[PDB]
């Protein structure tokens, strides 16, 4: 039950809040000062929203995998470390980065 995290990093955060509303049919559910997330059921996916005042377009800010327990995320962290992945651990989260460069993090909310 596992699902994507997509974070973005947007140039005008209101016309993206307004534009991925219209989107997945559906409100953020999270508002903060630069900052806004979306818990979508179909397609499964926390989509987050980081304004990036003075960009000149939207780019990707980093990837993820959200899991229900830290027993998931601790799973992955052995799995992906026995794997020959670089890992660092918080704590709940563990991040690996691909080798151009993107972050990911598998984590509980
Ligand atoms: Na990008
Ligand atoms: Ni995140």
């Given at each position: 039950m596992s699902r994507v995290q997509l974070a973005l990093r947007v140039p005008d955060l209101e016309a993206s809040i307004g534009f991925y509303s219209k989107l997945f049919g559906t409100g953020p559910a999270?508002?903060?000062p630069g900052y806004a997330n979306f818990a979508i059921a179909?397609?499964?996916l926390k989509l987050v929203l980081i304004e990036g005042?003075?960009?000149?377009?939207?780019?990707?800010?980093?990837?993820?995998?959200?899991?229900?327990?830290?027993?998931?995320?601790?799973?992955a962290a052995r799995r992906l470390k026995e794997s020959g992945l670089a890992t660092v651990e918080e704590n709940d989260k563990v991040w690996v980065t691909g080798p151009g460069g993107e972050p990911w993090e598998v984590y509980v909310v």
């Open positions: 999270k508002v903060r179909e397609p499964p005042a003075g960009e000149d377009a939207t780019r990707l800010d980093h990837l993820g995998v959200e899991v229900e327990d830290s027993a998931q995320v601790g799973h």
